[PDB]
Short mmCIF file of C-alpha atoms and ligand atoms in Angstrom, two decimals:
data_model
loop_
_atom_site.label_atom_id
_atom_site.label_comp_id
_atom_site.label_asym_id
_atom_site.label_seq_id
_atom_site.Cartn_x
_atom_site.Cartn_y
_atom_site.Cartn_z
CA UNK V 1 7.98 23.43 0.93
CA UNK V 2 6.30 23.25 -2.48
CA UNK V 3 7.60 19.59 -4.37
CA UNK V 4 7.15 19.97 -8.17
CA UNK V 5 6.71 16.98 -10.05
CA UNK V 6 9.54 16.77 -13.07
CA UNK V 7 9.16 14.32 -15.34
CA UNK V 8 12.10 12.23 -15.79
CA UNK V 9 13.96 13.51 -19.16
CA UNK V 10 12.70 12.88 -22.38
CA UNK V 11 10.37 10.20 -20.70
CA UNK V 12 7.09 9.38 -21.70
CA UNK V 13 4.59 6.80 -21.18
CA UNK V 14 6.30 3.73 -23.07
CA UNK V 15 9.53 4.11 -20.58
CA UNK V 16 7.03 3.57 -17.40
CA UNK V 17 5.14 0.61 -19.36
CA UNK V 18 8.41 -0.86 -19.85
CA UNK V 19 9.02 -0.54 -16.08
CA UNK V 20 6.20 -1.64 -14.97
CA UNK V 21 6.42 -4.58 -17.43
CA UNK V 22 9.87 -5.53 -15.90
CA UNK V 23 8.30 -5.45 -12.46
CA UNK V 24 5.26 -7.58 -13.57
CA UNK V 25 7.42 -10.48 -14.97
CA UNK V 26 9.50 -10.36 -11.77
CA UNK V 27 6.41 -10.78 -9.73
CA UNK V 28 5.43 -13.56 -12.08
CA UNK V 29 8.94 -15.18 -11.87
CA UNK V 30 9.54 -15.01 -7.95
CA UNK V 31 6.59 -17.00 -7.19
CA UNK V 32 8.07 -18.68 -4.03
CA UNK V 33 8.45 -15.66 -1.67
CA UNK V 34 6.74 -15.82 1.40
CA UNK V 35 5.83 -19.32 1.17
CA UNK V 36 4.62 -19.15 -2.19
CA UNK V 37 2.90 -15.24 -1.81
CA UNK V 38 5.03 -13.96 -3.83
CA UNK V 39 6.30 -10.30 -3.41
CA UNK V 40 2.72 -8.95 -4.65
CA UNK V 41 1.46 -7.65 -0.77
CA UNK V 42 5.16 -6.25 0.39
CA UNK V 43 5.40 -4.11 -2.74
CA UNK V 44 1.70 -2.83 -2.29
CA UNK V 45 2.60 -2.15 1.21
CA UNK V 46 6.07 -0.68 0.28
CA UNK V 47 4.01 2.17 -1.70
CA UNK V 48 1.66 2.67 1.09
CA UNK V 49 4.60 3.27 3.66
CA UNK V 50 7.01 5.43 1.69
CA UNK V 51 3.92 7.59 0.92
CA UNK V 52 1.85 7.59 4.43
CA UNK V 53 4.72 9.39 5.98
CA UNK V 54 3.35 12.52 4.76
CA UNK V 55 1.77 15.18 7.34
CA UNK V 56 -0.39 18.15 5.40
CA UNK V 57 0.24 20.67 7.78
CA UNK V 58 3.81 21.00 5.92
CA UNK V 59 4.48 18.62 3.28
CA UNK V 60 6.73 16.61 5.21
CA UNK V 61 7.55 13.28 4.08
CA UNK V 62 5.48 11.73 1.59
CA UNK V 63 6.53 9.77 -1.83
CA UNK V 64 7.62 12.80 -3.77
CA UNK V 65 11.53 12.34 -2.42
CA UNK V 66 11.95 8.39 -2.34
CA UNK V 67 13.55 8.82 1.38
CA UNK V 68 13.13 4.80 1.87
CA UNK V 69 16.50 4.52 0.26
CA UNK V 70 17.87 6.10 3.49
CA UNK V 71 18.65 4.60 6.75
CA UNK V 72 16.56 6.40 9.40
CA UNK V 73 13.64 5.53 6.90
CA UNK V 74 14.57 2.19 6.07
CA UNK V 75 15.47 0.35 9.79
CA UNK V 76 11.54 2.47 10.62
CA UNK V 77 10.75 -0.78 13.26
CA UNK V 78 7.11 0.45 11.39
CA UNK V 79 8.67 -0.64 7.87
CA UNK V 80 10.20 -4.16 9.32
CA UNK V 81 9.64 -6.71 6.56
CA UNK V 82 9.86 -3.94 3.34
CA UNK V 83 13.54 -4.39 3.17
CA UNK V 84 11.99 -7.89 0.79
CA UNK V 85 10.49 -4.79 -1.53
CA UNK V 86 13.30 -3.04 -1.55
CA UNK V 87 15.31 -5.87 -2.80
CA UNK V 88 13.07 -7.30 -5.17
CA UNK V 89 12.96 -3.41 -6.66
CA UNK V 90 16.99 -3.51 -6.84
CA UNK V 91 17.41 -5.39 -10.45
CA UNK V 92 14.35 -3.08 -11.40
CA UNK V 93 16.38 0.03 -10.28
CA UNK V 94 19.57 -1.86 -11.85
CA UNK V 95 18.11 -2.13 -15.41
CA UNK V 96 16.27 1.21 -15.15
CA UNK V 97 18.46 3.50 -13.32
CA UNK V 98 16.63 6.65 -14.63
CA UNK V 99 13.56 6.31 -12.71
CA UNK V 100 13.40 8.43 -9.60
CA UNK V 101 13.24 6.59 -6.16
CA UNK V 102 10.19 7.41 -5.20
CA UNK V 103 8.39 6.55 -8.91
CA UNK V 104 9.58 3.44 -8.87
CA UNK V 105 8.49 2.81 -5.28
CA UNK V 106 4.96 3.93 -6.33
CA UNK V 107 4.90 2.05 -9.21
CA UNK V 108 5.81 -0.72 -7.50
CA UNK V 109 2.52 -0.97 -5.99
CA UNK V 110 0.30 0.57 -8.64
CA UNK V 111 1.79 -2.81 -10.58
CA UNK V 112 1.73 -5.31 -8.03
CA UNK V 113 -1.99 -4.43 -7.50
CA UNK V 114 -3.01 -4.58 -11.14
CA UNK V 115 -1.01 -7.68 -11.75
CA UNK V 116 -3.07 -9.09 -8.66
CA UNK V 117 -6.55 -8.79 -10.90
CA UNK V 118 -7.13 -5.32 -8.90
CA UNK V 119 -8.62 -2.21 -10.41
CA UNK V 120 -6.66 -0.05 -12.89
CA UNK V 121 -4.77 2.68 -10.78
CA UNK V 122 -3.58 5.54 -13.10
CA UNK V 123 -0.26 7.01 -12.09
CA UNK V 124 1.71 10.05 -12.66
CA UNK V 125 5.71 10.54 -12.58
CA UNK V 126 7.81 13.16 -11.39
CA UNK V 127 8.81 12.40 -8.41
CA UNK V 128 13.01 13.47 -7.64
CA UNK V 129 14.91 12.39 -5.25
CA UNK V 130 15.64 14.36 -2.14
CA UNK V 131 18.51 14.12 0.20
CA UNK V 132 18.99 12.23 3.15
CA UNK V 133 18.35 15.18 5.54
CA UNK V 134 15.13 15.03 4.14
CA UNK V 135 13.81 11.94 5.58
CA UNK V 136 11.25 11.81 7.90
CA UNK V 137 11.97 10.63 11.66
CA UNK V 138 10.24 7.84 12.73
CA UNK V 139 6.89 7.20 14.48
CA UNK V 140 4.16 8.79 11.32
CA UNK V 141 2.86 5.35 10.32
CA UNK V 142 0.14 3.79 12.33
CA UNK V 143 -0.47 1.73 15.41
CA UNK V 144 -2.49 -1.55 15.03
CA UNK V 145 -3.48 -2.09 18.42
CA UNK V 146 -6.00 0.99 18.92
CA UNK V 147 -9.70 1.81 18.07
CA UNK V 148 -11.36 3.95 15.18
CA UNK V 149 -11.24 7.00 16.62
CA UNK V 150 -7.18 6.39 16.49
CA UNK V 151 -7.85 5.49 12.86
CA UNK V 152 -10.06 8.44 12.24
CA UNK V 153 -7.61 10.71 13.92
CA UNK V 154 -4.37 9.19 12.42
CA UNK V 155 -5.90 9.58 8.69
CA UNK V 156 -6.82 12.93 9.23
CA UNK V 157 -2.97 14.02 8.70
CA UNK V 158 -2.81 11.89 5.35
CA UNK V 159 -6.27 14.11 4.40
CA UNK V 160 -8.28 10.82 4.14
CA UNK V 161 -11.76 11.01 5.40
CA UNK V 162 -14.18 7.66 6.25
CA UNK V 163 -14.82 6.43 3.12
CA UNK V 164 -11.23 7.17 1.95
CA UNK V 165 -10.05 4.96 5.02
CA UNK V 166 -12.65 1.99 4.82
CA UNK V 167 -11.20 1.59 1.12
CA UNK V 168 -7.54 1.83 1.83
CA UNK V 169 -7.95 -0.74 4.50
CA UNK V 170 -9.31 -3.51 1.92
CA UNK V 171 -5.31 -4.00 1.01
CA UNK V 172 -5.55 -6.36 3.82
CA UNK V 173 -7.01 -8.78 2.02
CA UNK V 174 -3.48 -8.92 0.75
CA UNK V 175 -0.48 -11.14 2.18
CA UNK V 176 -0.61 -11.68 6.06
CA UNK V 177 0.76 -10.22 9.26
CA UNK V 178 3.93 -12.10 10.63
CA UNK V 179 4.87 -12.41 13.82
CA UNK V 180 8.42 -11.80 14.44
CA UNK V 181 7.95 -8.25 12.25
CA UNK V 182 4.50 -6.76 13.69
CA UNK V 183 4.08 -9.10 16.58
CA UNK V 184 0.94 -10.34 14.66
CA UNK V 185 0.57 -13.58 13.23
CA UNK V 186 -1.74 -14.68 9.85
CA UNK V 187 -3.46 -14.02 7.07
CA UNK V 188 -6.86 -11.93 6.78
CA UNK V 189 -8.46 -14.29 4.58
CA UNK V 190 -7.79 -17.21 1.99
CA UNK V 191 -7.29 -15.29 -1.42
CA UNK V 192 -3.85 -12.99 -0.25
CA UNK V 193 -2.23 -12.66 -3.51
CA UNK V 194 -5.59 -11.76 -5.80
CA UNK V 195 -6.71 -8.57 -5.15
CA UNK V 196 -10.18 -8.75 -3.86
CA UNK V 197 -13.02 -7.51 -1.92
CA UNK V 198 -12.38 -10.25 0.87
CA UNK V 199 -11.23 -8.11 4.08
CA UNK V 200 -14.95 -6.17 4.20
CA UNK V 201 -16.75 -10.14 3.75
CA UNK V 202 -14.37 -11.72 6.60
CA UNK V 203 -14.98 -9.27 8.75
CA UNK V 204 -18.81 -9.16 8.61
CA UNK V 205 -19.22 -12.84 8.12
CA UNK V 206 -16.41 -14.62 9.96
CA UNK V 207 -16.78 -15.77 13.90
CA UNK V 208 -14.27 -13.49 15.30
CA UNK V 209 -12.53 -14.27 18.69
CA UNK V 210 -10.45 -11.99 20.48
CA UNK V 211 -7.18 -13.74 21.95
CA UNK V 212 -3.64 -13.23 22.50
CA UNK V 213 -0.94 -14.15 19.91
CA UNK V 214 2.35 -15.61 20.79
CA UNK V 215 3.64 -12.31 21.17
CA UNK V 216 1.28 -11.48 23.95
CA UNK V 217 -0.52 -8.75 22.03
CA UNK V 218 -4.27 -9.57 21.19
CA UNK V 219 -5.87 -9.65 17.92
CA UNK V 220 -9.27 -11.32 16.74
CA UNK V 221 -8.92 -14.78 15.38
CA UNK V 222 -11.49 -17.34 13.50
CA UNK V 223 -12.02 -20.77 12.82
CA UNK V 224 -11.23 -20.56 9.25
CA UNK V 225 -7.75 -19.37 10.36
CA UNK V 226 -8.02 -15.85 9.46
CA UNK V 227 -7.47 -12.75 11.94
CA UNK V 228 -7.68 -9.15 11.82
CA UNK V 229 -5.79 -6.33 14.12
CA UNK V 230 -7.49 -4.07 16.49
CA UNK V 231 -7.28 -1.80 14.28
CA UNK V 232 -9.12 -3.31 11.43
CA UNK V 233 -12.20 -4.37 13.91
CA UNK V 234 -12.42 -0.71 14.64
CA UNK V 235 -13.98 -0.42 11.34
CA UNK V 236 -17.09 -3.02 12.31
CA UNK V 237 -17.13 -1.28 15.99
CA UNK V 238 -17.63 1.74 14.43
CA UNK V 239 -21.10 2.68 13.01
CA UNK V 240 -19.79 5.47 10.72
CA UNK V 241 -17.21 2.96 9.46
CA UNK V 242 -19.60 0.00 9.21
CA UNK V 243 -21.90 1.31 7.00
CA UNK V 244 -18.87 1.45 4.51
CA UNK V 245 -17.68 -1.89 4.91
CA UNK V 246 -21.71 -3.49 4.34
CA UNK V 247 -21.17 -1.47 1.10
CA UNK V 248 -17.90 -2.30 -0.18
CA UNK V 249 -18.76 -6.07 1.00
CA UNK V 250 -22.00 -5.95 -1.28
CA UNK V 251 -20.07 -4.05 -4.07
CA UNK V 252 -16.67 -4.85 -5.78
CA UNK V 253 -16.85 -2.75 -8.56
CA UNK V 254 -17.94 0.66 -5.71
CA UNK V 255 -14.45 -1.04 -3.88
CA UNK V 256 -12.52 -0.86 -6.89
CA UNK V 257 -13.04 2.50 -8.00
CA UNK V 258 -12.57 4.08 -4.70
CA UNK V 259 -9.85 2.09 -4.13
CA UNK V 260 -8.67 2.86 -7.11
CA UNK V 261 -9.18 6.97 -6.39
CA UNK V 262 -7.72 7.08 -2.74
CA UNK V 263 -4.86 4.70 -3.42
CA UNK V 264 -3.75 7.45 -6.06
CA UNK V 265 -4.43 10.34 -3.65
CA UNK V 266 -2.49 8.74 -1.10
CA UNK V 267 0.93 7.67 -3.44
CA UNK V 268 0.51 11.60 -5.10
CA UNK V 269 -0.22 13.58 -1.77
CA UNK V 270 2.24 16.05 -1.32
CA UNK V 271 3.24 16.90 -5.27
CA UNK V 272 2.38 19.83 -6.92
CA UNK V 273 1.50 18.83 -10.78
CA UNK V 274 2.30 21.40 -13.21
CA UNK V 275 -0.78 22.47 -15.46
CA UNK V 276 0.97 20.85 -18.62
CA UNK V 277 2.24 17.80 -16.87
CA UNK V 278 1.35 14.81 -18.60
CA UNK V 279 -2.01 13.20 -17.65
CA UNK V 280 -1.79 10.22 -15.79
CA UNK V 281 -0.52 6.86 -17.09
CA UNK V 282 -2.49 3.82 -17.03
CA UNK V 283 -0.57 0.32 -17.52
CA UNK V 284 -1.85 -2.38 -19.22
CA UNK V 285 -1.40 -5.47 -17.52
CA UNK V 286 0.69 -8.17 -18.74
CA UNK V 287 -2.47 -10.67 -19.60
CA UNK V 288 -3.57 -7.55 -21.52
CA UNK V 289 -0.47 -7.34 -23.90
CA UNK V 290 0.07 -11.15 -24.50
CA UNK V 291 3.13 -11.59 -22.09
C1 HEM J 301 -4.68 1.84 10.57
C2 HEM J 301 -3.88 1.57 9.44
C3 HEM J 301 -3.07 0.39 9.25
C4 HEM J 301 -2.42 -0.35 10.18
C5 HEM J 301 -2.31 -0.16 11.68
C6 HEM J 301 -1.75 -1.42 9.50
C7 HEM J 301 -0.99 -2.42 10.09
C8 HEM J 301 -0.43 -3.52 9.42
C9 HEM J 301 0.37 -4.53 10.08
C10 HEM J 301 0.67 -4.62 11.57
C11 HEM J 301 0.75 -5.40 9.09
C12 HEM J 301 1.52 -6.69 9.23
C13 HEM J 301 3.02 -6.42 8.92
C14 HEM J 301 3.73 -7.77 9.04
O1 HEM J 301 3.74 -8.37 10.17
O2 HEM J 301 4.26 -8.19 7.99
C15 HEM J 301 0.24 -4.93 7.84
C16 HEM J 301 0.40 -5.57 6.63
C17 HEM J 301 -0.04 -5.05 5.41
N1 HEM J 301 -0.67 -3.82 5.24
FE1 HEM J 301 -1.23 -2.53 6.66
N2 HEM J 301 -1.96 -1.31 8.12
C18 HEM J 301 -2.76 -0.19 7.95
C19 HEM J 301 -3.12 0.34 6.72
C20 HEM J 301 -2.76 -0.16 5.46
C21 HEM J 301 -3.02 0.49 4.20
C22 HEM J 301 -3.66 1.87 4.15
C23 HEM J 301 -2.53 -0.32 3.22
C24 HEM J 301 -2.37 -0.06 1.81
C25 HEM J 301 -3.38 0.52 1.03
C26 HEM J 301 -1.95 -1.45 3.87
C27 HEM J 301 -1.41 -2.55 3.23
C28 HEM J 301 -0.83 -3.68 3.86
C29 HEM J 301 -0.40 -4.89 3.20
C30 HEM J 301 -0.55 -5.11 1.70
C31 HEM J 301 0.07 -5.75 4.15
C32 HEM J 301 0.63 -7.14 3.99
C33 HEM J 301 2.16 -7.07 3.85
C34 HEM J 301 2.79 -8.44 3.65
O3 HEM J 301 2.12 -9.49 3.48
O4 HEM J 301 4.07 -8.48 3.61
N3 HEM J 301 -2.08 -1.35 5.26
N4 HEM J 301 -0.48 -3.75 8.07
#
């Protein structure tokens, strides 16, 4: 099935700024979330979850169709925690209501990680709502407790190849696992809620220990009080995936700009752009307007 991107009517890049705007001052304004977070990570991760549901062998899920909305999607025991996304985008939805579900999901995290001093992410709109029998089941988002040939493997269906990975992964610099929702506990490092190169220096510099969290599931812990899943120690195991992380630890700008590019691919795989779409929008920040 072929998804077209429509743009919403009579739209045009001022509407979207104005969205994003509203989003930005909300992030700004609900500064105690998460014991003083803020909503930054979840929304980042809310884009990354209503998008990494897509498989390429047939355009399944994905963020064209803003299926979140729905329950099957939405009580995912993969998305536990994203209901505090979903509810921070609700007066956003309210004041806006002709953005499409999955744009403003998408948007969501384009803004939260530009308001977070991360790279510029250009985004396109279009995305339309799709109904409920649409939804993907369960079970396409990852495991954390397996190895990098599981992470090589898994990515493969979102068409993400090494480096494309290795970037991704450097979100989890952002906000912290929590117990009682992954059955991981803490954060990956000590700046969560500015967007960062941090996750590729922690892992190659920090002591890591591998023990067992109060939920009996191990993960690899230091000193400093950081810790990292299985999953992201795969990429240090790894030589292929090593390599990348020495780089993007040695580079920020290199980890912004792919960032930047595969954080785009991931929230637009699945959407056919027509030839005379609009080119894609990028937001200024709020610092950059005055506000
Ligand atoms: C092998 C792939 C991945 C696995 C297994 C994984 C797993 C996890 C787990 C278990 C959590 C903790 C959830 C919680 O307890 O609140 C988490 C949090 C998070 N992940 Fe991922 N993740 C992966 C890839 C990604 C990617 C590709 C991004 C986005 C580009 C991302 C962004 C985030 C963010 C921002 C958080 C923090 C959320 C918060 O503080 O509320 N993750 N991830």
């Amino acid at each position: 099935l072929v998804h077209v991107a429509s743009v919403e009517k009579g739209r045009s890049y001022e509407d979207f700024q104005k969205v994003y705007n509203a989003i930005a001052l909300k992030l700004r304004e609900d500064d105690e979330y998460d014991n003083y977070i803020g909503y930054g990570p979840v929304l980042v991760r809310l884009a990354w979850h209503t998008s990494g549901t897509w498989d390429k062998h047939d355009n399944t899920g994905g963020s064209y169709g803003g299926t979140y909305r729905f329950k099957k999607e939405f009580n995912d025991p993969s998305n536990a925690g994203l209901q505090n996304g979903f509810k921070f985008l609700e007066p956003i939805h309210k004041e806006f209501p002709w953005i499409s579900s999955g744009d403003l999901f998408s948007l969501g995290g384009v803004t939260a990680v530009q308001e977070m001093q991360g790279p510029k992410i250009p985004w396109r709109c279009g995305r339309v709502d799709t109904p409920e029998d649409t939804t993907p089941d369960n079970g396409r988002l990852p495991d954390a407790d397996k190895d990098a040939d599981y992470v090589r493997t898994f990515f493969q269906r979102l068409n993400m190849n090494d480096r494309e990975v290795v970037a991704l992964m450097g979100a989890h610099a952002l906000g912290k696992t929590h117990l009682k929702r992954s059955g991981y506990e803490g954060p990956w490092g000590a700046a969560n809620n500015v967007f960062t190169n941090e996750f590729y220096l922690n892992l190659l510099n920090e002591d890591w220990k591998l023990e067992k969290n109060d939920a009996n599931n191990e993960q690899w812990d230091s000193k400093s009080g950081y810790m990292m899943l299985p999953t992201d120690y795969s990429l240090i195991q790894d030589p292929k995936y090593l390599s990348i992380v020495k780089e993007y630890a040695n580079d920020q700008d290199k980890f912004f700009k792919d960032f930047s590019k595969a954080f785009e691919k991931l929230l637009e795989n699945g959407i056919t752009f027509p030839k005379d779409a609009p080119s894609p929008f990028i937001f200024k920040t709020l610092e950059e307007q005055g506000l």
